[PDB]
């Protein structure tokens, strides 16, 4: 079994920085490649004693690219794997998905090709972008499009960054985003959510720093792909593959987005002091102080939930704990559901990587549920992007490119039908 | 890979040029003499996009100086950091316009500017992917407005893909050096609303300004105003030299500030900038770079925006810092003074961060705002223009080289149309 | 003398004209 | 068992001065080879680069061939009137070579035909020595001229008239351009400013990796004779794409999993190939592949069936065993200041197809379009040829162009 | 091993050949005493092809002087790198001719001619394998125009198989010297088409300009010029005295470069050439190498090769240099600028590769380009040509000395049939 996972624009091979140092520094590996069987979804064996991830860092910036180059991992990736262009999409969907796009991805796609061609048991694909940007919104639709067509039944994991309801870098981003999610729509299988507000919430309160960068994002990012992974690499008393979450969560072909969280994101101090078992674990694992979408499920009816359990964790408590969760109001499930929820237990702990700010805990939660609360965001998007359209605000640059006024009414009018659609399921 | 060609031209554009290339190459750790003597591998790695690998070490700048009077070119290779530049890229006349806009525009015009469109030729094919030009000049002089504008737009029409950044000083009544500043501005401005991609204004009394109240210079020769204007270049295009926590390049600049393709004027500020009396009380935190920046009486140009409304604006950020401090503090900006920025269109700040301080400071920015309070010159500019020409004044001197009056008409038509669009929109 | 400016003035032209065709050459070369 | 090497030209000398300093750093194997060669030119300053060099006390005396003046890139004059005062010299010596041999299993020789000398010469000297042997092999690895990168100008006149010998006398010939080496030195060996002597070191690893199965045991061995019977469907198509892998440097080479199944692929991708051409365009008459190191038969058994199973490339409807496989035991050596790694294991794919056909049909017309308007025929006629022998050394190509478009249908 | 017999003729021929012995001597590390006193090995083994061991490491240049004044013998003999020619070596009339082609090719010659080619043959037996003669001459002048051509034709009827150089410069009206130019230019060349292998033009016109542009020289003496000349000359035959990593004799350059028999007239360039304040500010590639190389404004003749096509050109490369980028550049410009090449000619350019630079140079560069605008001149003589024959200026100086109506009428002849030749290739 392998998966292999692939990074598009600054965010997501930032993204993929803190990942596979997160990765080889709880297997044991150093960053040049060889250790002073589990590994084998993730790194390929050369048969001399040097192990290489699966992954394909790309973007159209070569900035970001080259200082991974010559970072501490210059020798654990494979050269050909970490492709750069020569020049920005520069927030631009549509210089993204049709002007550079299409000179790049046909270079990324028969890379991918052999990295699946060396794996056997191929669980799926994972993606990492943010909607925000132009490389990541512009190429990402276009991969996924040409990866739907090239293999289909496989899994595509998509962990998208969306822009934050008030917290924004860029200004066009309203209208990257709806014409992204008009083609993350059909072709993802699974999509994440992971907002920036919610994060930077995260560790101003419970982290209890004032003072994020962008390091410490990723990391707990990379925390929960580990914690989600755990089932896949370890053996646990109750595990889950990534064609789980495929049944077991959408009840919907078109809806397939998800709320994220995890716990206990505590920091070195109130670990000492404090306790960790199963049922407060569960319980802050619901609590919208610790989600990574800034959404409110309170305001939504769930559909179903998922609970990753890592540690020492036996399965008798995870059972009352639920039990628990459901017997109180203050959170409900949809009347066609009795049952909501899909739970799992590993045995293995979660790691720590020095330098990080992640405390070492005894045992941990990944929470990953679908709800209702996700039809908010979207229409809040749809406020925003309206807003502007009408004037034809911006609009110059992207038709410019080669585009027109159609694409706008019609990617418009579809995730309008969407909102629609989220609202006739939680009647 | 991505490359800037540089283009000085006019006295304004030479002393300007001057001092810029000091500070850029003092940034990449290359002495007076052109050879690399600086200590850290980061300084190496982007050298492509300002300059050539000579032999031994030499370095050499990737801008083209082009006047008419030689004054400026021996004022050049005098002083320091004067014999790095190639003697090929001197392009250069010899009989002079002076603040003539039709003798800069139409008869030296004709016989120089093909011999700096080869030079600009040569140093665009001898670099592999162009991100743009660069060309500074002012708006008052002849030899920098008509034959710089007419360079703009030859080289427009020949690569019209590619951006370009203009930074133009325009006349001011309080600061008046010329007589015929608005026949010139006028014109020299109708050119740059169809050919440039992106303007940057600047004037001569906001940096006098500067230099009295922030910086409580003395004696402000020229070398201080050329050294706060070469700040803001260095400042603008660092992203492209220097990896940073989030890029933000010339082209994703452009697309996040200009919302239709005529509005495309903007005021520019730098922090920090203070006096060695009070440098030394300061602190260096997110806030104290913003709310030093946002101040109305530290921008370079002598446009007030709460006299206008805010379109859109942008801060480029240098050194290391916490990118949620810098996204709170454009939005307390943006939240507390609403009315001050446009309504349809939320969040109007586009914001990046560099991880490379320039040098002597600890942490830096710069400030870029599209406003429409620029229509203030427009409408200052145009009344003195109609104040000479519903009289005919100096208009010989035009007339006889080549124009008509239908060039003025129009020139103003589309000045005056220009500053009735900035207020619709307003 | 007239006809030295004619001359002068023909022939950049027509070299004006030449390179624009080899331009056009290029193009249709890295087109197939 | 032993074989002999001549080498003629500026090229051809050069790929041999490569080519032996790979054979003594890799040396009862020796015998083969120790040496049994002969450089032959009309210039002399190639030559006695050679005879100061570090190879002075390596090579006798006599060996080393060189005349008084060059051909100066032509045909006519290093094939009648300067060929005819040297080229008897070097075969008189070339017997008494085979002489002291007793198992002569062939000669291979090294020209380009471009140049005169390469190739006026060349030819030459292979219609003496078909008339002398006939039955001995003769295995000609010739460097044609590439379609767009190019060094001189009445290449293609003298390429025609080399090849109308090139046909009947040589028995197995590979074909090698430049700009295809070009392109594999930019493209896998990220040499982005190549000279000729990094062309001419990854040409001695080809050679070498084809004569290793005399000079070291394997699990299946294959001599020359096996070649002539295994690739040539046809007295007078023997013309052979090559192709080797992994062509890999120093780092990627650790980075990267060499092993059997994807290098069985990567020696089939037109972006590996020695020759600038197109195999899609063509089908496979019969491939023959050298394994050399590690390898079991196993995988190479495994790795030909999925060659066959996919539709991205096709054979000939004639061949359903299309195949001809070799493996031997030892590793290929490097060279202290090459550039290729070291490998457990490499294979060197020589096929044969119809893509060859579209690389005639692509010379016809350059040396068409001269020769209509008379260009440099002077030159040619004056040394002592007439316009009979252009015009049917045309016409003999286009009778190939026919029969390559006859057997692939 | 191959050999190269030097032959000097007239007060153009001497200076130049002078500067050019005074090169070659310096390349082959001999002392003006003709003494060996070089360093590297390289620059023994190939001393052959230009001189002869005399006895105790004499090496004496196997050159032959010829003139008619004695002026030039005693200029030659004055100055170092005088005293190591053989003084039996400098075959010379006594009376002149002085800008009479007449005198020079009828009176006068027919006494010393039979001198120089006793030493002549002397010297060309006395080597083993020649590879054939060179040549410097004028066509303006009398006694180097004239007896150098007759002794070119006699040449040829003894050695009718062995190569031949000529490097003669052509008179042009902008700089005219003598008045009798076209009368002996015109009748120069008729025996030049039928009598030299290959004639490498030249001329003052690009010589003065390009000590001018490029150069940049302040006063451009005779020394300067004929410097030049000479590092063409040393260019052209470098391929036998150095190993290299592809050969190009002489033999091999004449037949990639000459597509008909009558088509031997080259334009010649060197590179690279930059000022002396410049040296530094440049790199040295093979594209700086071929930019400079294709620049028309770069011939050593004053005729623009863009004013027609190139037949064929020829780049003879010197240093360590990948072969790639030799091909890849020489490709480049055959595409892009697809018009100023012939079309039924694919591959126009022919190149080579030598491993050892000229003394004082990391890589150089020699262009022979036979182009088609090389006919403008050919007219611009016969125009002139005609301007006195229509009316028998200076006509008697000439008649009176043995030619008729007929031989000036032939010479028209001959010259307006090669510039109809030239036009038909075009
Ligand atoms: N969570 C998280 N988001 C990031 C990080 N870095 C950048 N982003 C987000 O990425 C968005 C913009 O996209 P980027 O990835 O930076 O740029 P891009 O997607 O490659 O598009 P271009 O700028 O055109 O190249 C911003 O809105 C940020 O919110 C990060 O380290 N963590
Ligand atoms: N691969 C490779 N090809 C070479 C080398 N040297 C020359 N060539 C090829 O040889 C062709 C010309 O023939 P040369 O070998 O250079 O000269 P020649 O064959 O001896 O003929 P002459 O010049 O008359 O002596 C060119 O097209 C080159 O591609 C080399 O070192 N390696
Ligand atoms: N900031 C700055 N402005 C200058 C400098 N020198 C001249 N100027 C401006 O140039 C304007 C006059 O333009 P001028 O130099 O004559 O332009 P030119 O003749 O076209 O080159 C004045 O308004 C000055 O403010 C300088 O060193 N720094
Ligand atoms: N380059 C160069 N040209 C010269 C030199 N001396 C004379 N000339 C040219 O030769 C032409 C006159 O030739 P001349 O010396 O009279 O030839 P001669 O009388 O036959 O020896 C003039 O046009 C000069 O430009 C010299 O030293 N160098
Ligand atoms: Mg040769």
Same mark, same amino acid.
């Given at each position: 079994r392998e998966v292999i996972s692939i990074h598009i624009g600054q965010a997501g091979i930032q993204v993929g920085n803190a990942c596979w140092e997160l990765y080889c520094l709880e297997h044991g590996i150093q960053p040049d490649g060889q250790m002073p069987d589990a590994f084998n979804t993730f790194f390929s064996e050369t048969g001399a004693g040097k192990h290489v991830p699966r992954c394909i860092?790309?973007?159209?910036?070569?900035?970001?690219?080259?200082?991974?180059? &010559? =970072? &501490? *991992? /210059?020798?654990?990736?494979?050269?050909?794997?970490?492709?750069? =262009?020569? $020049?920005?999409?520069? %927030? %631009?969907?549509?210089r993204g998905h049709y002007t550079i796009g299409k000179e790049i991805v046909d270079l990324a796609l028969d890379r991918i090709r052999k990295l699946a061609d060396n794996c056997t048991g191929l669980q799926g694909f994972l993606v990492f972008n943010a909607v925000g940007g132009g490389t990541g919104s512009g190429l990402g639709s276009l991969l996924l499009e040409r990866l739907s067509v090239d293999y289909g039944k496989k899994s595509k994991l998509g962990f998208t960054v969306y822009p934050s309801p008030q917290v924004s870098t860029a200004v066009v981003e309203p209208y990257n985003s709806v014409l992204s999610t008009h083609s993350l729509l059909e072709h993802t299988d699974v999509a994440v959510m992971l907002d920036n507000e919610a994060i930077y919430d995260i560790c101003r309160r419970s982290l209890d720093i004032e003072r994020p960068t962008y390091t410490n994002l990723n990391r707990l990012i990379a925390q929960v792909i580990s914690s989600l992974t755990a089932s896949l690499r370890f053996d646990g008393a109750?595990?889950?593959?990534? &064609?789980?979450? #495929?049944? %077991?969560?959408?009840? *919907?072909? /078109?809806?397939?987005?998800?709320?994220?969280? *995890?716990?206990?994101?505590?920091?070195? $101090?109130?670990?000492?002091?404090? #306790?960790?078992?199963?049922?407060?674990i569960t319980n802050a694992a619901f609590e919208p102080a610790s989600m990574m979408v800034k959404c409110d499920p309170r305001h939504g009816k769930y559909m179903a939930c998922c609970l990753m359990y890592r540690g020492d964790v036996v399965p008798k408590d995870v059972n009352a704990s639920v039990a628990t969760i459901k017997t109180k109001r203050t959170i409900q499930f949809v009347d066609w559901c009795p049952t909501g929820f899909k739970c799992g237990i590993n045995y293995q702990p979660p790691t720590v990587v020095p330098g990080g700010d992640l405390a070492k805990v005894q045992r941990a939660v990944c929470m990953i549920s679908n709800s209702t609360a996700i039809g908010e965001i979207f229409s809040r998007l749809d406020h925003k992007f309206d807003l502007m359209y009408a004037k034809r605000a911006f609009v110059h640059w992207y038709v410019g490119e080669g585009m027109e006024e159609g694409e706008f009414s019609e990617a418009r009018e579809d995730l309008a039908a969407l909102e629609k659609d989220f609202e006739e399921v939680g009647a | 890979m991505r490359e800037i060609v540089h283009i000085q031209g006019g006295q304004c554009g030479n002393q300007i040029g001057a001092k810029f290339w000091e500070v850029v190459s003092d940034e990449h750790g290359i002495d007076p003499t052109g050879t690399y003597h600086g200590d850290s591998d980061l300084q190496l790695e982007r050298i492509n996009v300002y300059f050539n690998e000579a032999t031994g070490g030499r370095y050499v700048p990737r801008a083209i100086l082009m006047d008419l009077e030689p004054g400026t070119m021996d004022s050049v290779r005098s002083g320091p950091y004067g014999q790095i530049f190639r003697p090929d890229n001197f392009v250069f006349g010899q009989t002079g316009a002076g603040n003539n806009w039709a003798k800069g525009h139409y008869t030296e015009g004709a016989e120089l500017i093909d011999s700096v469109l080869d030079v600009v030729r040569k140093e665009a094919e001898s670099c592999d992917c162009l991100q743009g030009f660069q060309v500074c000049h002012s708006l008052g002089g002849g030899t920098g407005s008509g034959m710089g504008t007419l360079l703009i737009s030859k080289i427009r029409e020949e690569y019209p893909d590619r951006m370009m950044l203009t930074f133009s000083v325009v006349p001011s009544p309080k600061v008046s050096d010329t007589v015929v500043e608005p026949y010139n501005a006028t014109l020299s401005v109708h050119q740059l609303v169809e050919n440039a991609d992106e303007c940057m204004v600047l004037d001569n009394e906001a940096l006098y300004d500067i230099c009295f109240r922030t910086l409580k210079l003395t004696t402000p020769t020229f070398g201080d105003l050329n050294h706060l204007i070469s700040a803001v270049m260095s400042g603008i295009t660092c992203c492209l030299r220097f990896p940073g926590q989030l890029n933000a390049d010339l082209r994703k600049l452009a697309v996040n500030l200009i919302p239709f393709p005529r509005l495309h004027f903007f005021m520019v500020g730098f922090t920090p900038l203070t006096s060695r009396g009070s440098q030394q009380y300061r602190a260096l935190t997110v806030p104290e770079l913003t709310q030093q920046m946002w101040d109305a009486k530290n921008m370079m140009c002598a446009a007030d925006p709460r006299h206008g409304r805010y379109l859109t604006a942008s801060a480029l950020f240098r050194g290391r810092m916490s990118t949620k401090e810098v996204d709170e503090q454009m939005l307390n900006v943006q939240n507390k003074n609403s009315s001050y920025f446009v309504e349809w269109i939320p969040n109007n700040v586009k914001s990046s961060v560099c991880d490379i301080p320039p040098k002597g400071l600890k942490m830096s920015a710069t400030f870029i705002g599209n406003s429409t309070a620029i229509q203030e010159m427009f409408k200052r500019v145009s009344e003195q223009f109609t104040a000479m020409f519903r009289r005919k004044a100096f208009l010989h001197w035009y007339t006889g080289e080549g124009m008509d009056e239908m060039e003025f008409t129009e020139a103003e038509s589309n000045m005056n149309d220009l500053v009735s669009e900035y207020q619709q929109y307003q | 003398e007239a006809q030295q400016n004619d001359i002068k003035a023909l022939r950049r032209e027509l070299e004006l004209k030449k390179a624009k065709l080899n331009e056009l050459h290029e193009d249709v070369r890295r087109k197939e």
């Open positions: 860092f790309l973007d159209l910036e070569p900035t970001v690219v080259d200082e991974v180059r &010559t =970072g &501490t *991992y /210059r020798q654990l990736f494979h050269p050909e794997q970490l492709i750069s =262009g020569k $020049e920005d999409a520069a %927030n %631009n969907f549509a109750l595990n889950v593959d990534i &064609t789980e979450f #495929q049944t %077991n969560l959408v009840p *919907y072909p /078109r809806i397939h987005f998800m709320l994220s969280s *995890y716990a206990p994101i505590i920091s070195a $101090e109130k670990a000492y002091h404090e #306790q960790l078992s199963v049922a407060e | - | -």
